[PDB]
Scaffold this active site. Structure first.
Site, short mmCIF file in Angstrom:
data_model
loop_
_atom_site.label_atom_id
_atom_site.label_comp_id
_atom_site.label_asym_id
_atom_site.label_seq_id
_atom_site.Cartn_x
_atom_site.Cartn_y
_atom_site.Cartn_z
N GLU D 19 37.04 38.38 40.45
CA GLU D 19 36.66 38.37 39.00
C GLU D 19 37.68 37.59 38.16
OE1 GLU D 19 35.76 42.18 37.12
OE2 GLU D 19 34.09 42.55 38.49
N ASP D 92 34.57 44.02 41.31
CA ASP D 92 35.19 45.35 41.09
C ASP D 92 34.10 46.41 41.29
OD1 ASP D 92 37.64 44.10 40.54
OD2 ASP D 92 37.34 44.22 38.33
N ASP D 94 32.88 48.68 39.50
CA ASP D 94 32.47 49.15 38.15
C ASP D 94 31.11 48.52 37.80
OD1 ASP D 94 33.28 46.54 37.22
OD2 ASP D 94 35.25 47.25 36.67
N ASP D 96 30.52 46.18 35.27
CA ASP D 96 30.68 44.73 34.95
C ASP D 96 30.87 43.94 36.25
OD1 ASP D 96 30.68 44.18 31.95
OD2 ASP D 96 32.00 45.93 32.07
#
Ligand SMILES: NC[C@H](Oc1noc2ccc(-c3ccccc3Cl)cc12)c1ccccc1
Ligand SMILES: NC[C@H](Oc1noc2ccc(-c3ccccc3Cl)cc12)c1ccccc1
Lengths: 479, 185, 482, 188
Positions: D19, D92, D94, D96
């Site tokens: 990312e 990640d 998560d 996003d």
DNA sequence: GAGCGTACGGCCGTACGCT
DNA sequence: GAGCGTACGGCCGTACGCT
């Protein structure tokens, strides 16, 4: 109306003095610049200790910037990152979770991404900070108290070292082996008149976290004698069969950027400024350790290529020792012995003050226990005195007058709970009171005889040496 | 990043030099935008006493200040083409304020000396920083000609000035260090 | 098989993102009007008692605390959200009290968080009032090391008062701010007549009230927005034409439309003049100052009709702008398009819940306390016997049993008597205990009246809303031209 | 921005897409630099389903990915010129992360479909409860996620091309109503 | 249109002393 | 030299829906 010369001289002096005594130069006692001290004290005030779990860096930087260090978040975070890098700090003071950078000079991830706490050794920097061992001062806005210096129960200035660009001067102090340092301090503590030469039987020379080699004792000696000297650092490199050979580098000089150093070598080859190098790879991995491979053309001399690489790249670097630190708030160029003397003197002060404080607190407590004993021994009379009293103020006066009690003792008796009138509770109070009297006597023995202090210090230093002492990494080659 | 004033009459116009957009915004709100211009700089400016002329003329903060004043530099400096008759240095009341003040004064003295001679260079005196103050209070104490306290920079001895800039801001460290030790209190 | 169907991965991955952006980022709760990041900031201010009476704390300290404990996201996302709550041109009732450069109407940002300091506004105390009296449910934070509030008590109707704009996934929200006085009169009207019409509610709630003031053209857009949750509202700068001397006129603009950038709006006008796309404008100055307020001057050529130039400026610049109402908030954790009445009904229902729970909690605590005071009264009234009982007791455990048996006391009362300090045996202290005990019995009775009769409880809600309206209510700023 | 591996044998090489430089650095430390390359992206990447072709080809993150793979795009796509036989999406743990995963998959499916067909696209599975990979240490990131001995990659398999075309157009297309309908239908 | 407002991100200057 | 390490600073990308 303002004279341009007056404005320049007063303005520049204000800046220069501020950069010298409160930014770029470390204190000789705890080895810390302001920003480092404020971070470690901030970790301690929010009890971010090794046993408790990592806290977000943005939380720590915010707290430090708010309360102690009124400057940029980047200035604070990068200073914390460095203290957490095992390739920057010989004895790391911060325990990091996440990307805190590499030897290739990739930065730490942003503070949103990382978490941090104290290292076990940072407890020794802060030990007894709350026992009136060091002077506190008002923070920048006067809403907070911050420590002027840390107790520093190990000699951190020389152990971890320090580099700082000030105004009119800089500092550059190399890191040292903690075991060697503490043996040095013990030697000095037995012989105030000890020579630098004799100290160097304990303190061989610098010990960089990155290991590598130091060429000769000449530079080291000059630096420890005078506070200024050049020390030649060299990569640990060998020549090995690959019927063609290659140069393998496994350790690089201190504060040299691995990625940049390789690029300099590739650039010398690209620009045909060094002859015989057929390939250059960085086979470093966390499993293998540092491993930079330089392939040599068949029947090119590899020893000649290695000597050229030393002359033409950071594969050999000088460490320019310039041992300037703050002594009684002023920058001084100091030799090895001054640095150790100022440190030992700081320890004598910290242990004396701790002892004075422990005695103060014990006596205050003994005084209260004396009051409680009197109250329990005449409890029937005490109750009646308090019951016939209309207000707390009247009860305080009546208890003081009737039983020859201090205000502090009368307050303690009014604050006593009924559950303290049971049988086992009277014995428990006298048990604590008797142990307190032995402790008060032990403390007075220490304050009476300066030499008794020294013997105690020896044993506590030895405990630290046995828990934290470690092997030399940097080989010092004679001749 | 210049917020210029409406008036094009230099005799009654003044420009305020501030440390960043922090102070920039507070100042732009507080000011009389009829006669008071604002040039927010970007932190520490180039030490022109140490820097080579190539770097100085290519520097973006040095360029913006030259453009704003419209006088040009050195030999081509023309006091009559000045777009403000008051250049006000308004740095914070801290130590990094004092440094940016010495760095700007070094630029003005080496490249626009006649501006100082003409008495066009002033030093605001904010009562920690003014980047942290509100615009209402920043106007009343520091920018309002009715209550403010500017210091006009006066050049008395040009020989003594040349020695002082060369000592404090020059590449020779030993003279600077000597000065600090001598004047330390 | 570590093998994964591309369609399955897309559908489950995108749904995880989309759902998260909707229920936990971009849309506000209908009850307290807050998105997660706003709620976490205000709760963080409250947990570090950064209250209006105490002094401003550094923003970097606040953002660090919020990011550490509640909001595991970027410092910029948190700081910018706090800045906006502190801007008197963004928030009709600011929830954060800022010290320093928190930006201007010209769209220059706030200074970096190192530079600014912040605390609660007096009205943010009303958002948090009774958060500690079991009025709202707490939940675990992101790492389970902290408790954070699912919603704030919100003792004033904050969703409509301050408004809300949010780009989600599959939907957005755009709710204009309102006059607090008008809102609370609306809620009181609704609380007396559950069957009230939108039309009747609009006799209290005229329309939006923007912090920047200005004008709204007509009631058509407002009505459609309050009826259906969707409507376009035409906002207009407050501008007049005035003599400037020499028989020449000028247009003076003193109020601009909501969320319009002053600096950018002037640049559009200068650009129309530069590009000869509007005829008659001889000068354009921004004479805005803290003394004058907003003041944009447009000089008009001597021949030229100023009223025609003003109508052209409305057609060609943001000097007139539409506010696109799209009233989407979270209701029982799901996004719903709501009309004015649903929003007020959900709010009033939240207040009934908060005050009921507060009353249940106050009664619980008062009864527990009354029980302890009954024990202390018995102990003070037979203090000579109590002492002997405790003295003949070898351990605390034995004393507890002996006190319970001898004086018919509970374990809670016996514990309280063993914890009693000697200073409580003075003469004034026995009277002080009976004073507190008598007031407690009246209070317990007052609380039981409230829990018994829902009409008594609703009247308490009405009375507390009225107190807030009288302390924080303020004049309309935005003129609605009919 | 690419930290390439030493081996120039695509059959045994793999590239990790991460990312930011946060995850980039942690990954570059953890990796076997003999066979594991790393391309750190710069946050949310262009939604190619919504964006015009001019913008897509001028995008700096889209350009770096095309250059790294060395296959080219659309008609000129050549599976044999591929410089890695494993392209690993390592976002990640998560929400996003999930979005950047859908955005990359949309790019691969519209511009490099044969890469997915050949089974060269994989999805790393970092253990959940750390914030992202910028929050993991390199030692732990290697052992759980990058070590071929203990890691658990998901190979992206395209079953129904018609159903795939409809799913990308619905989730990542410019028509909001179909996307909103999908969310309401599949909520909880 | 373009930018509103929470989210994922990145990149550049300056001073200062010493070698 | 050119970079070490605390300080002063700043500026750009992307998603998402609606006007
Ligand atoms: N002590 C030897 C000598 O001192 C100073 N050089 O520059 C200074 C600047 C300031 C002060 C000072 C004086 C009084 C109070 C506070 C302060 Cl900070 C002292 C010195 C020195 C010379 C060369 C190198 C190292 C040290
Ligand atoms: N009522 C129609 C529609 O509702 C939803 N749109 O997208 C959604 C996504 C999720 C849920 C949901 C449903 C049940 C449980 C939990 C959840 Cl989170 C509801 C909706 C709507 C959207 C926008 C405006 C007006 C109406």
């Amino acid at each position: 109306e303002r004279n341009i010369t007056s404005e320049m001289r007063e303005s520049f002096l204000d800046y220069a003095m501020s950069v010298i005594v409160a930014r770029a130069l470390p204190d000789v006692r705890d080895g810390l610049k302001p920003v480092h001290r404020r971070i470690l004290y901030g970790l301690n005030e929010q009890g971010m200790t090794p046993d408790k779990s990592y806290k977000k860096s943005a939380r720590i930087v915010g707290d430090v910037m708010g309360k102690y260090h009124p400057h940029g978040d980047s200035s604070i975070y990068e200073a914390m990152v460095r203290m957490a890098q095992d390739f920057s700090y010989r004895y790391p003071l911060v325990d990091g979770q996440g990307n805190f950078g590499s030897m290739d000079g990739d930065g730490a991830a942003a503070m949103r991404y990382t978490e941090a706490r104290m290292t076990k050794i940072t407890l020794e920097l802060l030990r007894d900070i709350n026992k009136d061992t060091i002077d506190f001062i008002d923070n920048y806005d006067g809403n907070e108290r911050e420590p002027s210096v840390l107790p520093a129960r190990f000699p951190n200035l020389l152990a971890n070292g320090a580099s700082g660009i000030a105004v009119g001067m800089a500092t550059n102090i190399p890191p040292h082996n903690l075991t060697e340092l503490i043996n040095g301090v013990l030697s000095l503590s037995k012989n105030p008149d000890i020579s630098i030469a004799e100290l160097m039987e304990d303190i061989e020379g610098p010990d960089f976290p990155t290991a590598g080699l130091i060429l000769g004792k000449s530079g080291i000696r000059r630096a420890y004698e005078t506070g200024r000297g050049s020390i030649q650092m060299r990569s640990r490199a060998v020549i090995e069969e690959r019927g063609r050979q290659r140069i393998v580098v496994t350790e690089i000089p201190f504060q040299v950027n691995k990625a940049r150093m390789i690029e300099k070598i590739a650039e010398l080859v690209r620009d045909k400024k060094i002859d015989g190098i057929t390939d250059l790879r960085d086979e470093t991995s966390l499993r293998t350790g540092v491993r930079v491979v330089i392939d040599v053309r068949k029947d090119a001399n590899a020893s000649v290529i290695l000597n050229n690489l030393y002359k033409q790249t950071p594969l050999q670097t000088s460490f320019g020792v310039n041992m300037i630190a703050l002594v009684n708030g002023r920058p001084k160029l100091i030799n090895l012995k001054e640095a150790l003397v100022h440190y030992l003197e700081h320890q004598k002060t910290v242990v004396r003050r701790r002892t004075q404080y422990n005695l103060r607190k014990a006596k205050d407590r003994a005084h209260i226990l004396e009051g409680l004993r009197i109250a329990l021994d005449h409890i029937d009379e005490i109750i009646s005195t308090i019951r016939e009293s209309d207000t707390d103020k009247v009860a305080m006066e009546s208890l003081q007058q009737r039983f020859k009690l201090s205000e502090k003792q009368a307050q303690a008796i009014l604050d006593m709970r009924l559950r303290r009138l049971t049988g086992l509770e009277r014995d428990k109070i006298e048990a604590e009171y008797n142990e307190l009297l032995n402790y008060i006597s032990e403390l007075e023995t220490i304050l009476a005889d300066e030499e008794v202090l020294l013997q105690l210090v020896r044993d506590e230093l030895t405990e630290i040496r046995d828990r934290f002492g470690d092997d030399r990494r940097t080989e010092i080659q004679l001749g | 990043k210049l917020a210029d004033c409406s008036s094009k009459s230099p005799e009654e116009c003044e420009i305020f030099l501030v440390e960043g957009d922090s102070a920039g915004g507070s100042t732009k709100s507080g000011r009389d935008s009829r006669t008071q211009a604002i040039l927010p700089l970007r932190g520490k400016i180039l030490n022109v006493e140490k820097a080579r002329l190539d770097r100085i003329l290519n520097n973006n903060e040095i360029r913006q200040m030259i453009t704003a004043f419209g006088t040009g530099i050195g030999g081509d400096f023309d006091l009559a083409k000045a777009r403000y008759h008051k250049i006000v240095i308004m740095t914070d009341a801290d130590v990094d304020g004092a440094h940016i003040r010495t760095l700007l004064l070094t630029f003005f003295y080496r490249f626009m000396r006649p501006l100082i001679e003409a008495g066009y260079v002033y030093i605001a005196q904010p009562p920690k920083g003014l980047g942290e103050m509100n615009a209402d209070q920043l106007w009343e104490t520091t920018m309002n000609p009715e209550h403010r306290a500017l210091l006009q920079v006066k050049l008395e001895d040009a020989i003594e000035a040349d020695q002082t800039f060369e000592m404090l801001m020059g590449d020779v460290v030993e003279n600077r260090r000597q000065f600090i030790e001598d004047n330390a209190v």
